[model samples]
Target: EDIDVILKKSTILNLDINNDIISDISGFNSSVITYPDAQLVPGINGKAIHLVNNESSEVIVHKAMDIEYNDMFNNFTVSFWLRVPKVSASHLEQYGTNEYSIISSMKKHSLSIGSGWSVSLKGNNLIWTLKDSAGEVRQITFRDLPDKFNAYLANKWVFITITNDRLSSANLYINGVLMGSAEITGLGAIREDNNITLKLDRCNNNNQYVSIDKFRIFCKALNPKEIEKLYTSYLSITFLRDFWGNPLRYDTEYYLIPVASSSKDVQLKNITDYMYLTNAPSYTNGKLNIYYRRLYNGLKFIIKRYTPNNEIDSFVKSGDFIKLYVSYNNNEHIVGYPKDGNAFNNLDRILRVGYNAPGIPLYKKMEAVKLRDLKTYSVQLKLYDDKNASLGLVGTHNGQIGNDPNRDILIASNWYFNHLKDKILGCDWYFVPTDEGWTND
Candidate 1:
């Protein structure tokens, strides 16, 4: 999903100045007034707004613009792209004050005391000063500015995000990676009397010489994954959705069928080891070669084919008989089954075929085999009332799944049949009995 879509999905304030000189976009109708010196300049994309401290000059987005941080900002995410040029010692020192050089501030109008929060850069460290409901003040600072804050000072565009959760802590991120985090204490809500003003560039009398673009404020805090996506895409992340157009997470597991438009370069990393899959379906030389086909009955299907690799001797292909070594209820067994008609001659030695008509579900039983030392197994599909028709066995291309010792044989066969029925002719679709354990593989 594009950043705009994600923003519009739940953003409280989305300021994409683009080429406009105005601080807040229309429809947001947050009255924005800019000083003469603060104007739009060439930015990362089209143009970014520039702010310089001159006699308290700055850009201000008036408060009560449909946002109410009543009492406290319990959960919030603020992100923007910024580039700052080095300035003179006097200007830098003046801007280092808590009230000056503020990126943005949401607080009440009070000289001595106030409620609300402010994000600013002091020297090299990025800081968030917040006042909690109890009227106590807390500051979350990211120190050691030289190395940790180098990206923001070099006059190159850098994405910065600040997330605050009252129950957890405040986190500072530069270009998606977490730079620092501080425990929040006694955080209060914005003073009710205060019209929550979102100040940019300069705070009160202090000003910052910087270029900023794509400023956004979310009522809810964003997680590390979302922050990373925003940084990597430069706020241009694309979303993957199902047939229903609902967004899907990047780590979700999917069983996709093959199609022409789908790419064959698919890769998956194991969540446990945090390592990429090797010798899995379509995996070759550290890359995945998987493809997706068009939807069937509104559901997309994926087809996977395995190729041989250094760790494995050979890949399972269509029409290859397979035997699985599995353990059920602490008992081990060696279950063997054929892939197609080529192994039909061995059917007598193996389990005999069984059948059920179109209106009824299919059921079969195999004589139990002794526990085997091997760690893998395979199975076959049998449909009767036949004119002597035989179907090929299609193994899941990914060894991560097929190679699992606990995997069942029948379940794999059923998935392969249902997914590839359109390509396979004369194979009747039937439900497998739940208790059989044959259908679960």
Candidate 2:
């Protein structure tokens, strides 16, 4: 009991899902967030927490660690293994496509206390929602997973992690890889309440059953390496190894992201249509040269950007394109392209514009946009912001600079072609089937 004076005590609570409902930490430090009536079926580990006859949900209250749910302004990590089995199609109708299949959440003391945050399953998407005490909110959706991923409440085992630095950002991990992230600018710190706990499922909304195991919480945000180790702790694979390379043998499509080397901090010049990714993206070179890493079996690729600093993250839905005008490190850069406005509701149609993915193809994929008159569109992905920076759409790469032909963007109407040349870029979404496996180099 008195021994913790020696080692690191970052672990706040951990549940193995063994028949009993106790956490691995000392009894005094371990208190269940809420109580669940789960059955011990089978789990990725030994046994899992299953909701059998009745519905079972739980919550977490900070008892032992330095971190509490109230002031999440610090760093913290919530990691777990979850499985939601496929129910009868009738059950699907029960929750409605828009209904929330809450995986877990922490209520706001703003409950009489005020403001908090939570992660929920809204249809097939995973949404990490954060609300501050003063009414500020950010709903970061892990959008556009490959259709086959069945990203939400899949009837299979999946690892989930939320690592955050309350000041501005959060990251999500699947299996052992970084899937997506969310960013915030400042705080409406998470309001606290003694009774306010991290509850599982919509409070009393047992809309559906969940199988959970290896649930854990750390006082500090666990870095990627730390989170990966927790994932490997249960398996034998090297945490960072890429199991699948570019199996499709697809040609590398180079992209030009907008970034500048030194901060001239002035108006942007004319934009080039097919700028190469050299020099730099912020201020010089044609465009920052870049390409996607053929990871996750090539279903989806990571979109990396050159930023002086940024604190926001998002999962673009497959078939949709979004433009981000973001700021960080007192720096600004716009990454992603603005595509056709119709794509918002008709995301699948964008596939008709670019090279269709090889064997891991998109539904009725379309050819890359051919030479066409440069025209402006009024549609693009929805806009968002954290007060410090405004995230909206754009109409041109740089006021009709490039002549590459397939001129289209989602947010072009948000800003006129002659608008100030803020740092900018464009992005297109793709999906990788979960069954994607090892491919040759």
Candidate 3:
């Protein structure tokens, strides 16, 4: 039960130096003061605030984080991903002893000359110095790696964490691995003012610059596992794919949508919603809750007339907007499209009325209900089968389709036209693309 999530915890400062501002906390103000000549380059995640080689730059929080006067937790965790310059005066691999620049610092409140806490690079080693509320101070250097200075720390990202469980001790970790420990329980309290400053050049050293990202501070001592989780996890999942590593796709992932044009909560009189459903095997939450699971194509499905409720038979009046929602990759016209001057706008209901086309960049067109007159017939999208191919729906002889000999089979006329009018590869029908490449597809 030692799981310490970053955001869902007690945090004082969680700075995302990605786009040049302090990140928002749940219930805290993060206004900042800054003036920069520091450049912005790529970082471990997102864009970073690069200070290496910059002449002058400083980002100071308006009001310092006050933990001493407040009832703050005794334990705390400081975490950040850092990228040091390949060649720096602070590189111990190169310079044995030299001045250090403040990568980040919590300046001491008193003008009396003492630091509250700070993270700096000393001779290619990570140096952390802290002075607790009790006026106890300790400067610890993490130099576990060998002669190859900044071996894995320079020119790349290295997640560094310093956690203090007691007012007397602190543990330092590099990339989620424990590297060393120091007596930093003394760093627990405020010295004077606790303004957090990033890339402080007051040390008069600009040659010790570095890039930083995801700078965060938690008022709780996170465990080793929690530190590792924070290092490895991030916020986005690009392509929602399947177990086989391919995108998880489906056809006609259907839904019975209630539209404004139709009567709200209209009690039906044995009316049925139709679906072909031949592609996949029987699954849960099928369309219409399985009011009529199976039915032959090209028929008015399950519209059994209710004798007692004669008025209910016409409840869902012919032209009422029934948003029978079905999803497919393409936007094309079918046999049902009324003739148009420009076929680009030929089809109706491509975008459902009042439907929000979400999933960025595919901005959908808002449309009005186009087909207002259904008369005595039904309208539905055809999937997996062509109405004209059977010669039963759109019979062999065009005019005699609804005649007595044809048993009033109101021929689905011009079924052949739907196939021919399509300008795309799959004709007018909707397709579940083998790939989501709409431009080349």
Candidate 4:
């Protein structure tokens, strides 16, 4: 883009200006150096320059122009926009009576103390300083500078300029406002070895940094009117709002906000070794795969016990963990007899187990078996009636149930015990009465 109109003259330089020392000092005007991954957009306040460190490199820029001692060089002006960060080093430094420089880490407040620019006899104090030009020294003091940095300015930009025709004829402008003035004349001589070498200085951990967006230097000293005009012109085009319209109200607003913690990821472990599932739905290959079907009344489910050998004892003694779970989703339990036809007619179906009728008499059968002590087992009836459906499961030890006659009528089905490869065991028929009665089902 053409900056000629912005500067009201030919453009000298334009670039992003990374950590290169020369580019850092040239203010915002310099050759295109390097591009950043992201470019900061401009706002009403001004364009924000980015400062990145290059190992121990310090960014700086400097320009040298020879000047004559007479009126021919008495009048001149210099202006630039700057945004300073926290500084770890001194604010400014002075070399000789006629050489001096200024540095600011804040756009709102800038401290200037330099020499070799015609400062007062007290070297360290920057109350006033003179510019060591061709053959004279121009002095500038605190009272001759801005009262306070522009409070509205963000860490991004503060327009600064200094101009002087001769002694008692100098002016300072900050954000287009006449800050303060002093009677300062032109420098008497220019010391080549003492010329200013502008730099973005640092003292701690190589992290100290600052930014310069635009800079202007004029051979003729601009009067108060011209200074105000320049400030007003830039303010009109920039410094309206923060980069995001957040309003550069404080130093924090100019910086990137930290991210929230909840948005981060949480870690979890799968400790079951694929043997069991947690509350989360089961999945395969990272995708959920539900693999079961619901069972209603008369819905047969076959456990299909396996017996590698025809040994009945081996099948019953296998130690595999086994459990049967039933829920609304898996309707394994039921109530009511199928003979009644009406789903609710026979509200109950009692089932039980007993000794099978033998081909011989009871005494003969008992003698032939040489029977020892027999273990007895039983479980109470489990109902699957609408309101009393066994949605949840229940377990029993001895198959015996207390004589609550009503309880015996609600049972619907039965699971009989058997050894592998043995002949079929008597099935518990809830509808029928057997010898062992309801004590062994």
lDDT of 3 by residue, 372-436 (tens): 11110112222112222211111111112122232111112234344432222111111121211
lDDT of 1 by residue, 1-441 (tens): 765466556566656664365655524556566666666765444467676656444666665535655235558788888765533234435554544444545444455355566766655456777765466776767653332112344334567798877777878887777888877755555453233333353444343466677777777678887787666554221222221112221222232222211222112222111111122122111121111121111111121212222233222222322232222234333322233311212232111112222454222222111111111111123322223233333222222333444311122132333444343321121111111101110
- The candidate that wins on TM-score is 3
Superior candidate under lDDT, 1 versus 3: 1
Instruction: Give the higher-TM-score candidate: 1 or 3.
Output: 3
Put down candidate 4 lDDT per residue, 21-83, tens digits, no spaces: 224232333333333321343323334444433332222223333322222334556666654
* RMSD (Å) of each candidate, 1 decimal: 20.2, 19.9, 21.7, 33.5
* Candidate 2 local lDDT, 362-386, one digit each (tens): 2211112101111111012323332
The deviation in Å at residue 95 for candidate 3 is 4.6
Model 3 ranges with Cα > 4 A deviation: 1-7, 17-22, 53-55, 64-73, 88-95, 103-110, 133-135, 147-150, 185-189, 202-206, 235-441
The per-model lDDT (C-alpha) reads 0.42, 0.41, 0.41, 0.30
Candidate 2 displacement at residue 299 in angstroms: 29
Mark the regions of model 4 whose C-alpha exceeds 4 Å error after superposition. Answer: 1-46, 50-72, 85-128, 133-138, 143-156, 192-197, 201-208, 236-240, 243-441
Query: Against the hidden reference, what TM-scores do the models get?
Result: 0.46, 0.45, 0.47, 0.35
CA displacement after TM-score superposition, residue 107 of candidate 2 (Å): 3.4
TM-score of decoy 2: 0.45
Model 4 lDDT, residue 27, Cα: 37
